[PDB]
Amino acid sequence: GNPVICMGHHAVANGTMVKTLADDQVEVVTAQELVESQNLPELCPSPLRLVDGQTCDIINGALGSPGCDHLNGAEWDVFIERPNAVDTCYPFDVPEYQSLRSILANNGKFEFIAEEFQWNTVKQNGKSGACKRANVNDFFNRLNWLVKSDGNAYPLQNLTKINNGDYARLYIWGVHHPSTDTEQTNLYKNNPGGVTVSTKTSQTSVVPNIGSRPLVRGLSGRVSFYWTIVEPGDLIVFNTIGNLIAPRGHYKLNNQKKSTILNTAIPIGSCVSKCHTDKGSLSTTKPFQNISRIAVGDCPRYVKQGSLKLATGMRNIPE
Amino acid sequence: GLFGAIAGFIENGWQGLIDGWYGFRHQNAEGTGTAADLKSTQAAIDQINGKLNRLIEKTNDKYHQIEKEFEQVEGRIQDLEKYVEDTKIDLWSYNAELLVALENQHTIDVTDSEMNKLFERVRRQLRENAEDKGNGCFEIFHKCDNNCIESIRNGTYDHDIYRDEAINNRFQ
Ligand SMILES: *[C@@H]1O[C@H](CO)[C@@H](O)[C@H](O)[C@H]1NC(C)=O
Ligand SMILES: *[C@@H]1O[C@H](CO)[C@@H](O)[C@H](O)[C@H]1NC(C)=O
């Protein structure tokens, strides 16, 4: 009585190290990396609709600056906003800049609707040598520079637009700031000027402010942009005794806003992926990624660790 | 692991065992052999792939979030935005660290377990015809040719055939 039968298990020559609760280097036969640490050097145009702002950031695209024409009609899941975008128009600011940019990005589309504003006696379509469109003095094609009549008259403006549609409207307007008391009068005669936009449930009043400012592409003057949202059943009143950069109309707002914006220099390529970081798209099935906290789409969760190995086999004890 | 079979009373694994995770190595009068055990191999593979599948897809489908990079400090609101995100990241990193440690601890116990279940299965087949040598091997106290060995491996071994021979070899 002398035959022998032995029960055993496999082994390989060199396994992979993993962590347990007790040990941070246990060798197992196979393991699987759970942290994606490689990204593609491009952004995937599919399956998500990506829209490239190119030379325009999303605020300039909303305003209608020169060169931003490709963004008209544009619809996006993710707006790709380039770091080297540049102002090509009248020097401006938006007091609540990030809140406006957020609203535009999230809304997911540039659908402009023209309206005619019957401005009494004032001149319209005022242009500027800071906003050249093929060397011709121009302006934000969504805005209307109103100045004096030639008879030196800027009277009180008083027009109302009623929203009876089935969607909420976004109106973007502005207030012009001259650099001396002279300019104020050679543009809007009155001094001071002032704009007051109101709805049934809200209102906003602006004082123009006049003084010396740094030279931005040849000028000291500025425009301050504001926005008003007009729900179904509400309506909007524009009142002006001077300095109004009037709107050409209103942007359409989706009831459900599901889009966003990604700021990056990464080029848009040909790959397929539903996950985008500011470093490029991720093409992965791993549950975690260490590439960027800035991530949009259907993505692994961002973590600090560069590697987390899951054991997919038993301890490796070769020989 | 908890059962003390792998890296335990089984001294090491078999690099030659390439078509299974677990198996049988024997010696009898006509020679030696190594064969994979399918059932125990499959039981371990199923449990581990099960872990992989539950893992390789929950869902984190996120679009409009918050700004996470800033050129210049702004004060109160920016501090909160940074602190929310930093808090989220630490918590998810913690989750990821713990998950892998828990999964790996368990995976090692599962595979140690399946090794022990196989040993115990064969032990029970043999009844009084064999004795545990202490290293994952049974000494079989009767002649056991290649068909006998295969009958052990495929679960058709009938201990009553050899019991008289085995008992006599064990105790005298
Ligand atoms: C115009 O303003 C006057 C007062 O200045 C007010 O009574 C009137 O309702 C306003 N109408 C519109 C259409 O804004
Ligand atoms: C991510 O992890 C890899 C190692 O897996 C490391 O080389 C890389 O530097 C990490 N990235 C960051 C941003 O920490």
CA-based nearest distance B76→chain A, Å: 15
Walk me through the domains of chain B, giving residue ranges and CATH numbers.
1-172 (3.90.20.10)
Helix axes B76-126, B38-55, angle to 10 degrees: 170
What is the domain range of residue A136?
Answer: 49-266
Angstrom distance (rounded) from CA B99 to CA A308: 10
- Asked if residue A290 lies in contact with residue A308, where contact means CB atoms within 8 angstroms, the answer is no
Q: Residue A67: what residue type?
A: G
| B158/A110 Cα distance (integer angstroms) | 80
CATH number of domain containing A112: 3.90.209.20
Q: What is the CA radius of gyration of chain B?
A: 27
In chain A, residues with a C-beta closer than 8 Å to the C-beta of B1 are: 315
Q: Cα of A158 to ligand 1 centre, how many Å?
A: 6
Residues within a 6 A CB radius of ligand 2: A 37, 290, 306-307
From chain A, the residues in CB contact with B133 under 8 A are: 4
Nearest Cα to Cα of residue B144 among B169, B172, B107, B119? B169
- Report CA dihedral (B72, B75, B78, B83) to the nearest 10 degrees: 120
Residue A285 to residue A288: CA distance in whole angstroms? 9
- Burial pattern A205-226, b for ≥16 Cβ within 10 A else e, equals ebebebeeeeeeeeebbbbbbb
The Cα–Cα gap between A256 and B144 comes to 76
Longest dimension (CA), chain B: 92
CA A76/CA A259 separation, integer angstroms: 7
The answer to whether A7 and B136 have CB atoms below 8 angstroms apart is yes
Handedness of CA A80, A81, A85, A86 (dihedral sign): positive
For residue A249, report the distance from its CA to the centre of ligand 2, in Å. 49
Residue pair A196/A206 in contact (Cβ under 8 Å)? The answer is yes
Q: B1 CA to chain A: closest CA distance, Å? A: 9
Angle made by CA atoms B150, B152, B158, in degrees to the nearest 5: 115
Using DSSP, state whether A226 is helix, strand or coil. strand
HSE at residue A277, side-chain half, CA atoms within 13 A, is 21
d(CA A266, CA A273): 15
Which atom of ligand 2 is nearest the CA belonging to A291?
13
Q: What angle do CA B79, B83, B85 make, to 5 degrees?
A: 125
**Residues of B with Cβ-Cβ distance to A312 under 8 angstroms:** 48, 52, 107
Residues lining ligand 1, CB < 6 A?
A 158, 160, 237
Residue A302 near residue A288 (C-beta atoms within 8 A): yes
Strand partners, A311: A31
**Contact criterion met (CB < 8 Å) for A295 and B62:** yes
CB A251 within 8 A of CB A266: no
- Neighbour-count burial of A197, counting CB atoms closer than 10 A to its CB (0-12 exposed, 13-18 middle, 19+ buried): buried
Burial of residue A193 (number of CB atoms within 10 Å: 0-12, 13-18, 19+): buried
Q: Tell me which long-range contacts A188-193 makes (C-beta under 8 A, separation of at least 24).
A: A188/A147, A188/A148, A188/A154, A188/A241, A188/A242, A188/A243, A189/A148, A189/A152, A189/A153, A189/A154, A189/A242, A190/A154, A190/A241, A190/A242, A191/A242, A192/A241, A192/A242, A193/A240, A193/A241, A193/A242, A193/A243, A193/A244
- With the C-alpha atoms ordered B61, B65, B71, B77, is the resulting torsion angle positive or negative? negative
Structure tokens at A197: 């936009």
- The answer to whether the CB atoms of A8 and B13 lie below 8 A apart is yes
- Give strand pairing partners of A47: A273
Distance, CA of A110 to CA of A250 (rounded, Å): 10
- CA–CA separation, A123 and A113 (whole Å): 22
Pocket test residue of A32, A36, A284, A290 for ligand 2, highest count of atoms within 8 A of CB: A290
| Determination technique for this entry | X-ray
